Symmetry: D2
Subunit: 295 residues, 4 copies
């Protein structure tokens, strides 16, 4: 036997950081969950009980906290790049660092219409994420994403003209509910190293803001022919607005809301134009995926 592939490190490292402006009193908080997995000349740790090649996962955890102490943790694309670059530069035998960051929302509270200097609310479990792959000799590959953005529209969704055969029961509809959890990923041009990442820093927050705004506006305004057709419009708009993105990927559940026929009870009319009460379906769910690039 032989090792064909190997990576190891520390997962689920919870990190908080505070910035304190001691001139204004304004405090800003950041909270994330970090995973760092390393690759390199480590096969002997598996094959020969050779722990000399192991940078302990416990040491990787310490390094995450130290790096957060020594650097801004925002945007997460930059933090992940600094952290990944540390491992491949520090250790001659480590050749790749794979950094995943989940950013948790701490939105400043408005109290009596004024932003509070040091109080925050988790406005929803929506995440901003990065996957930063730092590969010696191959630069820095960044995928940025938003996930767990849960939305619903009560009309201006349609689904008709689909294939109908002996497996088909689904009625065509010209007016349905559409609800999803948005998972949207934008894949950056390869960066040569930390300098090139730093040269583009403002684009990270700006492209995340664009991706979110385009997702919400397209969802709300598209008289949707399908999940497929609506998600493609989101992707093409995001590509049009940031030349440093190569691809946009959407992964969208179709979280079904079924009509309830109540006509068996006192002739109640609750279908078609009279549909008011629906049964949200926990499972199963449509799952629709696209990766869109430049033609």
């Amino acid at each position: 036997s032989a090792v064909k592939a190997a990576r190891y490190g520390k997962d689920n490292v919870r990190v908080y950081k505070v910035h304190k402006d001691e001139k204004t009193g304004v405090q800003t908080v950041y909270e994330m969950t970090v995973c760092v997995l390393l690759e390199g000349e480590i096969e002997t740790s598996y094959t020969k009980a050779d722990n000399s090649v192991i940078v302990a996962t416990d040491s990787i955890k310490n390094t995450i906290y130290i790096t957060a102490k020594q650097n801004p943790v925002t945007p997460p694309e930059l933090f992940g790049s600094i952290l990944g670059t540390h491992f491949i530069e520090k250790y001659n035998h480590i050749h790749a660092a794979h950094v995943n960051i989940v950013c948790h929302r701490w939105t400043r509270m408005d109290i009596d219409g004024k932003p509070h200097p040091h109080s925050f609310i988790r406005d929803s479990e929506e995440k901003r994420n990065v996957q930063v792959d730092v590969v010696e000799g191959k630069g820095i590959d960044i995928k940025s994403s938003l996930s767990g953005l849960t939305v619903l529209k009560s009309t201006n969704s349609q689904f008709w003209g689909f294939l109908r055969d002996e497996y088909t029961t689904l009625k065509e509809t010209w007016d349905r509910i559409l609800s999803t959890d948005v998972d949207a990923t934008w894949q950056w041009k390869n960066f040569s190293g930390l300098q090139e990442v730093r040269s583009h820093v403002p684009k990270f927050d700006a492209t995340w803001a664009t991706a979110r705004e385009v997702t919400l506006k397209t969802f709300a305004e598209d008289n949707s022919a399908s999940v497929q057709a609506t998600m493609y419009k989101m992707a093409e708009q995001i590509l049009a607005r940031q030349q440093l993105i190569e691809t946009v990927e959407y992964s969208l559940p179709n979280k079904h809301y079924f009509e309830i026929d109540l006509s068996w009870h006192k002739g109640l009319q609750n279908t078609g134009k009279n549909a008011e009460v629906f049964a949200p379906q926990s499972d199963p769910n449509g799952l629709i995926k696209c990766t869109v690039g430049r033609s």
Copy 2:
């Protein structure tokens, strides 16, 4: 043997309802999860296989959908009262209906600064809940609550002057992080029946709004001596603002954020006044509970 207590019915009934203003085009959505459990002269279903006394849980589910079709589903205090009253009035042998409703957030989207007529976002997993106990001859007992309201303040939290003995390691602090998930419950005066509930309908949304506003403002503005002292201030303010509430109950985790001593690494200073990077603790957690009434 004998039945000392019995209740049964349907749990986890997911319900959606849409209101459509066909004059303005504005659509409004409501989504909840409903549980209805019945009590009454039902012991023989347990003791003698006597299913004649069982209103099938499947029929309870149908009744939830029918009631939602025939009535507004807001405020949940009213909906729960209508639903509970249905079972004790319809069935001579059913003497109590216990209705629990969890209300899910669907907040109207703002697109280009304008409220969208039919698109919504789940802004966080915060819930508004009711427990409505409709008991034949004993009226309607309502407990209203907000839950899963997750907040953090980065300073203006203290914890000192606690008991110190041979079991104590905790350092006193005059400046710490405080984070919790707010579970706040207000218990209404007993109502005689549906008419009395209906006579107070506006107070339900108003008292929920008060409970939330008081929670957020007190949390943000109290230079906290403890979770105990801060939560008591929230309760006393809510009681002062609604005479139809008898008690306010808070159940608050203390979601700890630990300092990380980094002085072992290049003399890094990350404690006390220099604390920037913290380790959020998933478990264990302080758990602090109060029920506050009028003196």
Copy 3:
């Protein structure tokens, strides 16, 4: 305003303990999650920022670990009694300790048909639990439970002769699937203190084993008329087998498995006697509860 009720302490305290027989080499592991909440003369911590009455939740956590070091952690009824008794005896102003323990399964591995001396498997997420309420002057109230015991029978379940009215669509059946997650609780006679608990120690493991055996055998062998009728048989048998139990409580979901009519496709027969493929329903679920005592 005034404090009507108050309790506080530490939740979600994960504890592991190992016993090592250094004569046989056999090691035995225990893992639990502990919650301790205290009551007593603590209202001033809420009303006057008086932290002098607070035994810090951090100190409660330390005390859990110290108590586990100084005592066996099995059976959990005894451990919870020792832990609760510590707080009301140690602190003059603490008058109640409420101890909840969840016991996690670590079942010894059988390797090549021989029990391994120090390797364990989590055979399912089934829990053994206790709630121990130690109240100064009122002794020790223990509720023992098993929970998350997930079972299914593919036949010998029936449901007919239930109430049928204008809310009813459910077809009577003489042959259905029955599946549940068993939550069974047995409530002990009040104990005067730790000595009386210790005098009954063997009964705790024996009564848990009885409750589990009776649950499984009754579920498997009862040609069930309803969840109600089957659960009552379990309760009456457990009461018959342990005179120191006062009540037995079951809380059982009816985890529905729906027939799928496939007759629309090539006349496939998949209902009634021909039913082979079913759709497990995640929600909603029947929820059936009983408390059974001696007549």
Copy 4:
């Protein structure tokens, strides 16, 4: 813009099937969760609102139930192959079917030492899984796995001789707890189509049984130098025992159990040789991955 990649279908399809031997009365149950995603000439559904190319996700769901009715659902490698082959053969424009199956445990109950004919227990949340990729012109690629197999050993785990630098605090140890959740995957030789899969059917259950037995025996018996060294031994043994497997992959968390120094309290000794009470750590966790092939 252009579609670079696209797949869609139905996720989270819960399926139950019963087999009834009407000669012996013995009933056997199967429960799974199925996902089917299709690829093919479907880009116009995204780009031009062309629903004619869409086999509705609802129809994919119907097809899963119909296929389960018409075929055995075991082993899952065969069921997934039949299901995937259906879509690429039935639809000229569908060129790939990606079938993921999670198999849920329903283990026959033993009542009074006799196997019960129709009663089952979920002995733990351990899963048996398949990923079956059926690609027109490229045959059938199967990855088999077991997941959520949670184990602990209380000794005969070591971790020393790892890299020590200015980022390192971890003490070397010659005796620690090792606990993990086993995720093990074996990747089959490419199969030309359904006939070749069928020709190997007995090997699926046999190789799953081998993978589980080798995992448990190696974990229990290896005086472990690291997670790396132990998992490699499992992989090399599984490869040695089934020539139709090309690779074995393990993904293992190191679920840490920390010593608790209690020497601050009455000089209690709970470290090193005296360590009895430990603090299970929910997060962070080491994460160790290998893919092993033939040299």
